[PDB]
Ligand binder design. Sequence first.
Ligand SMILES: CS(=O)(=O)N1CCc2c(c(-c3ccc(C(F)(F)F)cc3)nn2C[C@@H](O)CN2CCC(c3c[nH]c4cc[n+](O)cc34)CC2)C1
Length: 221
Amino acid sequence: ILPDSVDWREKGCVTEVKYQGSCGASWAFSAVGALEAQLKLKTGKLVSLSAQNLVDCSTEKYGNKGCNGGFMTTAFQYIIDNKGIDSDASYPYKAMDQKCQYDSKYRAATCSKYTELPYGREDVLKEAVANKGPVSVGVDARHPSFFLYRSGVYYEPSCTQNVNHGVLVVGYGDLNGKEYWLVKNSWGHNFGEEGYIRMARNKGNHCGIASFPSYPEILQG
Ligand SMILES: CS(=O)(=O)N1CCc2c(c(-c3ccc(C(F)(F)F)cc3)nn2C[C@@H](O)CN2CCC(c3c[nH]c4cc[n+](O)cc34)CC2)C1
């Protein structure tokens, strides 16, 4: 039996909204956001993890291009392969491609595996958000309505199921009858509701929110 509403901010699993700047690294912010929540569930400690570490180190082997884009799934694979990711404090974000400076001395999290959810399945996404944690997703963000969004439940008739911007689903609910996904963006506090957007849910995979969902886990064995 799934809750009607969830908000992982209430469970202490969501760090401050970040500002990616002119670097196209939303993939890296989406990935660290998902892992931040799993780290809190494991250790009780909420700590921002290094998006820069992913930008600089999860590169050609993972199909990622730093400030020119990339993928959450392969970001997670880098963290698995590397046996760690640094804290954001120890390896801060500069919004540029830099030489990899990963140092195991400042490791703040590990990742054992990741899971991809099936294309377009908002019911499966709901279950994962309720029972696993925040889920990294792609959205179609290429409409003025998206970047100008201030409040309410976002619905854009021209949205497609093709995704181009990485964000984090941290919850869901309903606002005066409109079902929504609660989405953490990485465009700082002047986007949306202090950095968050509520996006239409159960409206035929609106803006591709359920097209490419994935989440990491931190496990023994
Ligand atoms: C137009 S579309 O929207 O239909 N779409 C098409 C399909 C798609 C999209 C995203 C998608 C797009 C954007 C985002 C976001 F913006 F959020 F960041 C998220 C997901 N994923 N896939 C699934 C895989 O094709 C992604 N896969 C392909 C292999 C590739 C790769 C190259 N070298 C490697 C070395 C090692 N490994 O392991 C993998 C590779 C990267 C991983 C976009």
